[PDB]
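STRUCTURE:
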């Protein structure tokens, strides 16, 4: 048994709207935009399932469907608005959200602006040492699929594109040697 921490940055590539007229979802303590763990997870899971419910998907993301309750190896935090974004956007006078009319019948839609970065954390639970590499390959695949799709609303009109970067993998509990694990971007 071991826990492996995967951390890095999610960068908004096109305006991101994940909702709670239509405000974006926020961290209740800071009032800043947040990318909920369940949004990231839901898309990774769906995209990976669609790529191959399939045991490689299930053991990674779990299932609460009737008769087959398997626990998730992979836990996905909320991704929080980074300090670096705060400092950079503040100094250079860049908007971190903005509100547009949709495409008094138009809805008013807020989005997180491109260049906004969020710190993310995934925790991987080593329930089976022999499966870690295949699992990390599948996590990598899921991230790639997510980068070629979108999060949130307005996806099919171009919104919600994101990019993962500056990822780091550390064994935080246990002796599993994770130094050879790597999430290859693109
Ligand atoms: Ca490492």
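SEQUENCE:
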């Amino acid at each position: 048994y071991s826990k492996i921490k995967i951390s890095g940055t999610i960068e908004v590539v096109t305006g991101l709207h994940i909702g709670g007229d239509s405000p974006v979802v926020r961290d209740l303590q800071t009032k800043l935009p947040i990318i909920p763990g369940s949004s990231i997870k839901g898309k990774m899971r769906n995209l990976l399932a669609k790529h191959f419910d399939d045991e490689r998907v299930l053991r990674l993301f779990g299932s609460s469907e009737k008769g087959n309750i398997q626990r998730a190896r992979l836990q996905i935090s909320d991704a929080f608005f980074s300090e670096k974004t705060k400092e950079h956007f503040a100094q250079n006078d860049i908007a971190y959200t903005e509100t547009k009319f949709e495409n008094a019948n138009p809805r008013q839609i807020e989005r997180v602006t491109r260049g906004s970065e969020f710190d993310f954390v995934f925790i991987y639970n080593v329930d089976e040492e022999s499966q870690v590499e295949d699992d990390f390959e599948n996590i990598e695949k899921a991230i790639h699929l997510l980068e070629n799709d979108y999060l949130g609303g307005g996806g099919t009109r171009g919104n919600g594109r994101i990019q993962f970067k500056d990822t780091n993998i550390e064994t935080v509990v246990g002796e599993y040697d994770s130094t050879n694990l790597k999430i290859k971007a693109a």
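REMARK: The pocket of calcium ion is lined by residues 169-170, 178-179 (CB under 6 Å).
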